[PDB]
Amino acid sequence: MAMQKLFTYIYEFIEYRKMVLLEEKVPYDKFVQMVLNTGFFRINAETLNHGIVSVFIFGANGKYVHHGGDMRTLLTNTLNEKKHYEELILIVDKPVLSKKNILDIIVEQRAANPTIVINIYPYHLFCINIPKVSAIPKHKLITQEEAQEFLGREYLQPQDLMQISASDPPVVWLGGRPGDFVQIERPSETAMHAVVIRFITKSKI
Amino acid sequence: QSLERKNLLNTISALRTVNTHQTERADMMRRVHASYPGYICVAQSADTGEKVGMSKQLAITANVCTAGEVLSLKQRLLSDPAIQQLADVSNKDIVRKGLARVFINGEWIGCCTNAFELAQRYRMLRREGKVVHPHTTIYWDSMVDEVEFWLDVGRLTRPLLIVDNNIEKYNQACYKAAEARKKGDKDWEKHKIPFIQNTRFTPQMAKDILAGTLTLEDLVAQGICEFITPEEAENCLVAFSIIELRKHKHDVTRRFTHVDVPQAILGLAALVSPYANCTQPARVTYETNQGRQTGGWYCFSWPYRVDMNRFFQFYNEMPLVKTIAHNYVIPNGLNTIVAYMIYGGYNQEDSVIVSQSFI
Amino acid sequence: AITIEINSTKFSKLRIPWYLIFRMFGMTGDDSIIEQVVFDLESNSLVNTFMIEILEKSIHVLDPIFQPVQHELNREKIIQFLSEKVQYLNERQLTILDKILLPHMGQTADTRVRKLRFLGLLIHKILLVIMNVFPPTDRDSYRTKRVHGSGVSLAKAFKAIFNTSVIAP
Amino acid sequence: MKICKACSSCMVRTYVDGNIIFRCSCGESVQGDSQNLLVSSKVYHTGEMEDKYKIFIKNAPFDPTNCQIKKDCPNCHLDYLTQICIGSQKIIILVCRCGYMSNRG
Amino acid sequence: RSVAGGTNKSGIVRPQEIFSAKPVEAEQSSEMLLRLKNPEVETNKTYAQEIANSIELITFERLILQWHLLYETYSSTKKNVMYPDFASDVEWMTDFLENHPLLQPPEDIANWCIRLELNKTTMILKSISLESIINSLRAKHPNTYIMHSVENTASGIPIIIRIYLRESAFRRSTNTRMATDEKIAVNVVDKLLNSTIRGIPGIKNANVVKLMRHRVDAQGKLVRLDNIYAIKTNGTNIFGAMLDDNIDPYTIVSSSIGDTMELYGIEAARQKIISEIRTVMGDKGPNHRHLLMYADLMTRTGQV
Amino acid sequence: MSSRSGNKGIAALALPTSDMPFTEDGLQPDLIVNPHSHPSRMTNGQMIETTVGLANALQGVVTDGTAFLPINVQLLSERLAQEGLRFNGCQKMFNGQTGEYFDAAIFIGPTYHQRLQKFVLDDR
Amino acid sequence: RKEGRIRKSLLGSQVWSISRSTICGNSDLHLDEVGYPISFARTLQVAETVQHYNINRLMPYFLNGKRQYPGCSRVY
Amino acid sequence: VGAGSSGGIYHLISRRYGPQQALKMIFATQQLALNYVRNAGFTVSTADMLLTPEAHQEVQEIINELLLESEEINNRLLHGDIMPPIGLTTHDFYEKLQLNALKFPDRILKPIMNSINPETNGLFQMVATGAKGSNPNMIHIMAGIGQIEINTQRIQPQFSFGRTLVYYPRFALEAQAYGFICNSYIAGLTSPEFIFGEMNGRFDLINKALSTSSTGYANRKAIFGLQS
Amino acid sequence: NFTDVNIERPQHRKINLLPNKARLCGLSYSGPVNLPPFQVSTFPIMRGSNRCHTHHLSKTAKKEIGEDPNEPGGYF
Amino acid sequence: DFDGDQMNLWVPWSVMSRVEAELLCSVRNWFISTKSSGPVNGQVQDSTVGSFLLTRTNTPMGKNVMNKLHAMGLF
Ligand SMILES: [Mg+2]
Numbered sequence A: 001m002a003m004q005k006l007f008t009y010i011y012e013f014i015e016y017r018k019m020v021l022l023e024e025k026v027p028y029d030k031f032v033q034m035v036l037n038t039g040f041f042r043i044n045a046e047t048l049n050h051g052i053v054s055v056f057i058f059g060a061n062g063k064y065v066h067h068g069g070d071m072r073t074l075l076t077n078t079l080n081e082k083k084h085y086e087e088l089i090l091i092v093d094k095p096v097l098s099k100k101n102i103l104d105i106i107v108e109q110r111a112a113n114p115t116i117v118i119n120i121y122p123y124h125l126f127c128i129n130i131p132k133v134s135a136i137p138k139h140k141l142i143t144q145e146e147a148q149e150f151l152g153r154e155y156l157q158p159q160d161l162m163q164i165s166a167s168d169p170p171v172v173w174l175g176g177r178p179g180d181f182v183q184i185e186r187p188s189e190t191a192m193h194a195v196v197i198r199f200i201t202k203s204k205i
Numbered sequence B: 001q002s003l004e005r006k007n008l009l010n011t012i013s014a015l016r017t018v019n020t021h022q023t024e025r026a027d028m029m030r031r032v033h034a035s036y037p038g039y040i041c042v043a044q045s046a047d048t049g050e051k052v053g054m055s056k057q058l059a060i061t062a063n064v065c066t067a068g069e070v071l072s073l074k075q076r077l078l079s080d081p082a083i084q085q086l087a088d089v090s091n092k093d094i095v096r097k098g099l100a101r102v103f104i105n106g107e108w109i110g111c112c113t114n115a116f117e118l119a120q121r122y123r124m125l126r127r128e129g130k131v132v133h134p135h136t137t138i139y140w141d142s143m144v145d146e147v148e149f150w151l152d153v154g155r156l157t158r159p160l161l162i163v164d165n166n167i168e169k170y171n172q173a174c175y176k177a178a179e180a181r182k183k184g185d186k187d188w189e190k191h192k193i194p195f196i197q198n199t200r201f202t203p204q205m206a207k208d209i210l211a212g213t214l215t216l217e218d219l220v221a222q223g224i225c226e227f228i229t230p231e232e233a234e235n236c237l238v239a240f241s242i243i244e245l246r247k248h249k250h251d252v253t254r255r256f257t258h259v260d261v262p263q264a265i266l267g268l269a270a271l272v273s274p275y276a277n278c279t280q281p282a283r284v285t286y287e288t289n290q291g292r293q294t295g296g297w298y299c300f301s302w303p304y305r306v307d308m309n310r311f312f313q314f315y316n317e318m319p320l321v322k323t324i325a326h327n328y329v330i331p332n333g334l335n336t337i338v339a340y341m342i343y344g345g346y347n348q349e350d351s352v353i354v355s356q357s358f359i
Numbered sequence C: 001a002i003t004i005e006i007n008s009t010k011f012s013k014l015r016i017p018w019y020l021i022f023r024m025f026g027m028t029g030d031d032s033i034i035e036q037v038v039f040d041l042e043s044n045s046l047v048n049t050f051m052i053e054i055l056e057k058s059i060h061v062l063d064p065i066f067q068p069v070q071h072e073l074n075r076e077k078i079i080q081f082l083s084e085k086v087q088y089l090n091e092r093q094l095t096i097l098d099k100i101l102l103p104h105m106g107q108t109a110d111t112r113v114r115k116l117r118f119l120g121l122l123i124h125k126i127l128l129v130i131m132n133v134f135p136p137t138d139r140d141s142y143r144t145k146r147v148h149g150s151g152v153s154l155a156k157a158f159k160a161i162f163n164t165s166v167i168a169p
Numbered sequence D: 001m002k003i004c005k006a007c008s009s010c011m012v013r014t015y016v017d018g019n020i021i022f023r024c025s026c027g028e029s030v031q032g033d034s035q036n037l038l039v040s041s042k043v044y045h046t047g048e049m050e051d052k053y054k055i056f057i058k059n060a061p062f063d064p065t066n067c068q069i070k071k072d073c074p075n076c077h078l079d080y081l082t083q084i085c086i087g088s089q090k091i092i093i094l095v096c097r098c099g100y101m102s103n104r105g
Numbered sequence E: 001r002s003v004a005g006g007t008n009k010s011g012i013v014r015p016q017e018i019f020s021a022k023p024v025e026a027e028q029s030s031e032m033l034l035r036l037k038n039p040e041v042e043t044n045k046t047y048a049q050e051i052a053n054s055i056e057l058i059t060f061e062r063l064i065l066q067w068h069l070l071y072e073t074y075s076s077t078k079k080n081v082m083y084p085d086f087a088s089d090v091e092w093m094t095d096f097l098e099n100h101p102l103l104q105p106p107e108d109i110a111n112w113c114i115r116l117e118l119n120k121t122t123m124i125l126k127s128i129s130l131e132s133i134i135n136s137l138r139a140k141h142p143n144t145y146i147m148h149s150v151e152n153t154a155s156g157i158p159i160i161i162r163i164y165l166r167e168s169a170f171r172r173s174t175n176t177r178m179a180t181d182e183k184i185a186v187n188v189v190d191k192l193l194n195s196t197i198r199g200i201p202g203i204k205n206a207n208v209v210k211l212m213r214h215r216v217d218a219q220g221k222l223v224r225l226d227n228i229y230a231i232k233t234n235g236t237n238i239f240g241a242m243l244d245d246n247i248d249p250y251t252i253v254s255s256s257i258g259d260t261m262e263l264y265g266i267e268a269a270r271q272k273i274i275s276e277i278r279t280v281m282g283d284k285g286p287n288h289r290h291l292l293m294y295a296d297l298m299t300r301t302g303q304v
Numbered sequence F: 001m002s003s004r005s006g007n008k009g010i011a012a013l014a015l016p017t018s019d020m021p022f023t024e025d026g027l028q029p030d031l032i033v034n035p036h037s038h039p040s041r042m043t044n045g046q047m048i049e050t051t052v053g054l055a056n057a058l059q060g061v062v063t064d065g066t067a068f069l070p071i072n073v074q075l076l077s078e079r080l081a082q083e084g085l086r087f088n089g090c091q092k093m094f095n096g097q098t099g100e101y102f103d104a105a106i107f108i109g110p111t112y113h114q115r116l117q118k119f120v121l122d123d124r
Numbered sequence G: 001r002k003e004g005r006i007r008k009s010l011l012g013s014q015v016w017s018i019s020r021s022t023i024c025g026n027s028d029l030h031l032d033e034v035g036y037p038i039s040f041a042r043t044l045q046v047a048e049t050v051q052h053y054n055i056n057r058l059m060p061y062f063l064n065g066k067r068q069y070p071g072c073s074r075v076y
Numbered sequence H: 001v002g003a004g005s006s007g008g009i010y011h012l013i014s015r016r017y018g019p020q021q022a023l024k025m026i027f028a029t030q031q032l033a034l035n036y037v038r039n040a041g042f043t044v045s046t047a048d049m050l051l052t053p054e055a056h057q058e059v060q061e062i063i064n065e066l067l068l069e070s071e072e073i074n075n076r077l078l079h080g081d082i083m084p085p086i087g088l089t090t091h092d093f094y095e096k097l098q099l100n101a102l103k104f105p106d107r108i109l110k111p112i113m114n115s116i117n118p119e120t121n122g123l124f125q126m127v128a129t130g131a132k133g134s135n136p137n138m139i140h141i142m143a144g145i146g147q148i149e150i151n152t153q154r155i156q157p158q159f160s161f162g163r164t165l166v167y168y169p170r171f172a173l174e175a176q177a178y179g180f181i182c183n184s185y186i187a188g189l190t191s192p193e194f195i196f197g198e199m200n201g202r203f204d205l206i207n208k209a210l211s212t213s214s215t216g217y218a219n220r221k222a223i224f225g226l227q228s
Numbered sequence I: 001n002f003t004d005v006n007i008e009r010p011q012h013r014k015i016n017l018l019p020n021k022a023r024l025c026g027l028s029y030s031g032p033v034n035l036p037p038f039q040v041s042t043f044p045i046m047r048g049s050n051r052c053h054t055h056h057l058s059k060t061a062k063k064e065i066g067e068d069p070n071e072p073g074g075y076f
Numbered sequence J: 001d002f003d004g005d006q007m008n009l010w011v012p013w014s015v016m017s018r019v020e021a022e023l024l025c026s027v028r029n030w031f032i033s034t035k036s037s038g039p040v041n042g043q044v045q046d047s048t049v050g051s052f053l054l055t056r057t058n059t060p061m062g063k064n065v066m067n068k069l070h071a072m073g074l075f
């Protein structure tokens, strides 16, 4: 089911993000037990810039996904810890994404900490190795210098480019922030593969 | 609509046209419904545009009924001892005693102990033709056990030749053979008689019709043919031709109530086409459209009349291969000599090369 | 719920529940009203029981428009509320009703019982169709069609034109 | 069904709380026996067709538009029998005027 | 084209689904092509068939002959005043009680019972045991109590199960207290009848299809394989088939643009639009670049 | 122009008498209809009508060709043979412009044709 | 709607200097040739501005006028 | 040389010499073909569509095989041998079982080709060279129409309950009652066979009208979303 | 209430209005209806009906008044 | 087709529209289909069956040969 796939592929997501785990991996039984008891499983990883990315895995029937007060408490407590906190990732059931109160607390604490990136994603984002899916063309983030020279040669503003959501599964796995540029190598039945650059825009939900 | 005088065919088809006034509904109302044969020409319709199937033409024998004497038949039904009035039977009696609801023009009057018996008795009274008018509709619904009598205006009727069986004698002989077999006789099979079914129409009647001395009214009054409505057509097993009736002359498993004339399923415009059943039916529909837009003697009073966009063609010929339609509409067109051949590529894609001298 | 709408200049856009029309016509008892549709109350078989439960749920459904009279057995109250929605006034609204409700059965007060029996039969047939006992009526079959020309078409147009040009002034 | 004896109406259920108590518009109440506990039910595609076509099957030997087959009637010994194919299960039923019905279904 | 239920591809229904960007639920001909994990078992048609059977969604009401929402409670210490027809259940209701000492009827029970009769023909047809049904119902319905008969007996004795509602389910309706206990009890029947006993949700059917595929050999030749078996389902659930271990999760092909977009992203949805339009165009379709114009226009914003 | 089988056609060529093809007996067409107009639309009634009318003209009769009357095209072709023509209604034919005979015998005969009242002077 | 100012008057147009007729086959015309009847050829006109390089070519048109073909009927 | 033939000679002439050369070559080769038939002659006859008496018997025997195969399926229905597989009801299984049994074999071309002289038959040559017509057209004219199918199913009993037409009994089991036409066009259809062809023929006319209007509304919405 | 009715054959100012006269002159082939008995109304008549002047006429009789002897009528 | 079809024809009178008509909208530019990238035009009907009759190896008269006069007459 969703929990075992999420458990096996969240670490593939962390490795694909070029992140190193601060803690140690627990067996699957311990993970599911901790999800059932605490209501979430928190995985902390460190980026190349020594920033901290915390991954929260919320069970379907946990208290946090139902009552916004506990979500507020958890987020406010973790965000006040003495960590660099490059990003916060919250993995929940897809029906939770349609729950207005949880979204309200997410956006409220996002406004409370302008520096920290807080993102909430469904399970299916991390229930597979997204970059290894055949139907997904190879995405890669390009630096602002490469994007700047490409736009200068093309006489384009970033807003003229085709757009891509920051919540797109390949972009989530890449870790692309809004305002960044992602180059896609798409297969072509007319040219036998092609390259486009898409502008990353604000995340959905 | 404006009477378009393209030809006599256009006139009598414009007066024979029935008008109905991107969904499944649009598809379904334009189809050839299985209730059409004999009443609506299965070929005639528009071939282009949204008017496909929106225009319906009466078949050749199809007529439109006038309102019959509803009250006379209603009093005959009420006075019938086989019908029990509504004030005498309750709903509980209806379901318990197996009574069938009797309607006249959709108005429920009385109930009967046997729907089939009532329908057959009144169909016989209609065949004889004095007490029950031949244009009345007597429909028995075997699925809900109702007998409906219809005499309202607007019914489509067509005459159908009646087929008669010896099914009563066949049944009696079957019982006799069974009883002989049960008594122990070895030759009980000799008691069985062959089943016979036929129409009473004889070649003499055909000659008399052609001679003019026999009319349809005489055939109806003699019990040879009777008028059938789509309502009653749902109660009929019709042999599509005298060939099919003759093939099953002794088939007790296929007992027809009527025998059809195959040309009756087409209208005048469709019957103009010769060997239409040897052609794709869509082309016969194309003929129904095109036969009504051809020049000719569009109106025999043309010089007295002042007309707009009316074309009078000097020369008309009877077709060398004529059809039954030309007995009723003046033939317009010519028996051109045509060569089916390639001649220089000038007749490609539905073009024609014409003789300038012929023009 | 089973709501019966009569299309008329006075009666329009109103969907009277069926039992109300049955009670306005007499025989206020709901058991006999049910019998008018099921034809037998002491009968087995699943179609009859399904009909009875269907009619029960129809009776008990709260009509947002006919809330006060949903349970009333006072026939005069039903007729009065109908009149305001559309004893001498009690009769007139009932007298206009039978003329506009199944006129082919009759337009006089001696045809109310047969009108109710026929209406019960119609409801029964609709319920048989909803039970998949029978298919819907074929909209293209010619058993249920009529062809009208000249005589019928002009007379109805003459009838409409006669009052407005002769009688109306 | 429960019909109010005071006014011949239908009494609603109002399950309260361990027992059924039928309630009318009169305020009349008759409670209810052990057979009143069936709140709802459903039987799946079972027990139909023969009763659904009871009138039609009874009328079949007399309808002249029904297909007939060459087969002796075991009851009255007619070499022809009326053949009926009803339902999506395509149930063949052979009936005769005498009353033979061949109840397979 | 067919007009059968499950896939309404008649007329212009499918092009409108593509061009008007209808969501997954609005689709009437959704399909998935699932590849069996690992290529050696791929050629096994019997293996592919049993994976298909395990994938088809099995709803509880599929296994049920009849059900009756009764008004009766069970305590095992009282008379309980049971329904006269179903008072014979107490012969095996006591037998169940002595066989399951760990599942005594609780005190918070209600008097709303749902007696159902299982279809043993369907159970053996899909190879579903009674305990598999019982475990599925308890896992998904924590606010009910379930008793049942014994499944080992032969024909003539039916499999009977009664779900007894608990008072916990009724207390959740205070926010919508206009609905009485009857409406809640009937409501839980619909939820209970639609509980998933087996299969992937949304997979109405799963048929084994023979695929044409290419592969590179040890010699480097590109050969075309005609012995490859895969599962073609009615209905789309990419996430559901992704969680299945018997399905290659990286080669799931759905006919839906909406499900491809939510699961895979805009670039995969853009490729799905091309493939979906090309299916409609037939074998006399336009140049491929005209399909790129449609898909790139429809996906230029990051959304379909 | 149209035949009674619904095969419409636009007249685009007027050839003089000397330019029309003619048979060995001097029979020449009024209309030259492409054989490619037959196979797709399957207007076989027109073919059968021409076959029957070839024998009708030589016998000096007008025959009933109503739909659903019994038809035997083999017997109609045998009737053609009995009237002195070939089994098919095909004759040796000469090109009018050159005088050369076609290698194939050409099917030529009387087919009833109608002028549809759509006029080019009205349309243009 | 389809008859409105946008769809009928703006996105479409009624135009001058245009002819319509039934089409028919001509195997003696090249694939990029169209057979234009002479009556329409005199109705529809081609505007030729007179200069030194075309004055001699345009004179036969001008002299023919409406009487003879190839003619001309207008001068600005 | 055909129109729309990718990789044909005119496509090649366009690729190497230009589309104007291809247009000039289409006209020039057209004149050669037309000037050849100016001497060769080409015609179609009623005898071109006529089967020999031996081939007509061969076609009759083929159809009798299809009717017997349909008849045996009926006998399996009379005795209840029709066992529908999972996913289909008995009616659905029977209907698809009858459609398969009433399909014409490939060998129906054998009597047609026996009667046809390919080097001289104008009807065959028009079909065989791709000029006009198809093999099903030739079989329908010469051998038999076969089974009428509307929306990949036989004629539904819409006349009444269990009746397709007034000419057939209720719950008729003969294949002819449901759109099987044993006759060919040359043989002439009977009245009920002609009616079924009309339903199929009118169905195509309706589809042509509805498709053009339905595609037109989609075409304009496609234009406005893409024109920029 | 009205109880006196008689539709009369079409009249021209009174002379019998023949269908040809109505067609050429542009009138309406209508007949008066009576409703003491009075009449202010006219009602179009169907050619060929018993209320038409051509009901009883034979082929030659139809020819003398200018009507088509062969057409059935049935129009207004 | 030629079963009654009508087509509009307008002759460009302006110099700009005439230059455009000749260089851009000439039907030589539509010989290859934009939709399918294949050729649109070719032989139809008589020329399709006449090309087969011309190029077939054998006729019923023997070999498919013509003398010099008829070979010249084809051109
Ligand atoms: Mg055309």
Ligand SMILES: [Zn+2]
Residues within 6 Å of the ligand: D004, D005, D006, D007, D008, D009, D024, D025, D026, D027, D028
């Ligand atoms: Zn009461």
Ligand SMILES: [Zn+2]
Residues within 6 Å of the ligand: D073, D074, D075, D076, D077, D078, D096, D097, D098, D099, D100
């Ligand atoms: Zn018997």
